[PDB]
Design a protein around this ligand. Sequence first.
Ligand SMILES: O=S1(=O)NCc2ccc(Nc3nccc(N(CCCO)c4cccc5[nH]ncc45)n3)cc21
Length: 257
Amino acid sequence: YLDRKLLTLEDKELGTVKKGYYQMKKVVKTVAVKILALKDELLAEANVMQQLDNPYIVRMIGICEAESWMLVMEMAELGPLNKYLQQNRHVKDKNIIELVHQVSMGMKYLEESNFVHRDLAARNVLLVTQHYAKISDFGLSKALRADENYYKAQTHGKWPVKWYAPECINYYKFSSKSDVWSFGVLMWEAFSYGQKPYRGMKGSEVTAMLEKGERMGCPAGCPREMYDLMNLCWTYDVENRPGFAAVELRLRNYYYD
Ligand SMILES: O=S1(=O)NCc2ccc(Nc3nccc(N(CCCO)c4cccc5[nH]ncc45)n3)cc21
């Protein structure tokens, strides 16, 4: 738990979200703060992110119980990737490849830590700099049990279907391979400069489209290798869909080529 005394908030708003500062041992650290049901979701996120430690996942500083309930993270100054790219269409393809490779290195670690994100989308990638991305928003994330490969969704809550693999929609099964499907949608978003996927379509319409074997097209100016990778992530049969080690490798090879 954090010390309220050591936390300072801006008035300006970023429930509610605020930018702040927390006095660490000697340096002052810029932080982003969620300020409060909606509480169990924030507790689940705190519980997960306290077990995570990776350069490509947003770091939790801690929980402050004061006048309000607060979840304090290190600040990723530039904000969500979808919004950033929407306002910065000059960003080169090679820079996008760089950012999406970083996300895949982050997801490779999660996979290895046996956690499922369950909400991997461009809106949940935050930028530290134009060349440094972190995965955020672990509200729906689940620590897999030692004896299982997947999480079985029970209660009906947030359901971002446009990022969900068929086995999630059809069998309520979430695994690292389902996160791979979502990563594919995230790539598509990033190479489309933060445009929403399957625009104009209902969730049930997206599902019907995918079952016919149809996929979203190649965004303008997306190199074909990256589009080929999106299609691989969108492999229907989860058995034959790649995991984050295979996905990360292919981005690494391409990027460094
Ligand atoms: O709230 S914003 O989308 N409005 C513009 C802007 C600019 C920078 C950040 N950066 C940032 N950097 C780290 C964490 C964090 N947030 C707020 C995200 C809004 O949901 C968080 C606070 C607490 C827990 C969190 N988990 N994931 C993000 C996050 N936000 C966030 C935003």
